[PDB]
């Protein structure tokens, strides 16, 4: 057996200055994943105070709003 966490994009915090989604990580650190990577397909958030790894569920249209908060535009329109 093995076990794996999946989470919804809504549940994460976005930090517009950093273009980054974070989530509370049950170590000293935070799960982290970048906006530009997610646009390309990347769905895995990494917590590097340990290693642990969580799957983020989103589609492109869930990304429109955070482009806007960041002050930028997507590489291709959504």
From Swiss-Prot:
A Gene Ontology biological process term: tRNA wobble uridine modification
Residues holding Fe cation: 25, 27, 47, 50
GO cellular component: cytoplasm; cytosol; nucleus
Domain DPH-type MB span(s) in chain numbering: 3-59
Catalytic activity: [3Fe-4S](1+)-[protein] + Fe(2+)-[Dph3] = [3Fe-4S](0)-[protein] + Fe(3+)-[Dph3]; 2 [3Fe-4S](0)-[protein] + 2 Fe(2+)-[Dph3] + NADH = 2 [4Fe-4S](1+)-[protein] + 2 [Dph3] + NAD(+) + H(+)
UniProtKB keywords: Cytoplasm, Iron, Metal-binding, Nucleus, Oxidoreductase, tRNA processing
Physiological role: Required for the first step of diphthamide biosynthesis, a post-translational modification of histidine which occurs in elongation factor 2. DPH1 and DPH2 transfer a 3-amino-3-carboxypropyl (ACP) group from S-adenosyl-L-methionine (SAM) to a histidine residue, the reaction is assisted by a reduction system comprising KTI11/DPH3 and a NADH-dependent reductase, predominantly CBR1. Acts as an electron donor to reduce the Fe-S cluster in DPH1-DPH2 keeping the [4Fe-4S] clusters in the active and reduced state.
Organism placement in taxonomy: Eukaryota, Fungi, Dikarya, Ascomycota, Saccharomycotina
Keyword flag Cytoplasm: yes
Gene deletion effect: Sensitive to caffeine, paromycin, and thermal stress. Resistance to diphtheria toxin, sordarin and zymocin.
Positions of region (Required for interaction with the elongator complex): 66-78
Protein known as: Diphthamide biosynthesis protein 3
Alphabetical list of SUPFAM superfamilies matching this protein: CSL zinc finger (SSF144217)
Gene behind the chain: KTI11
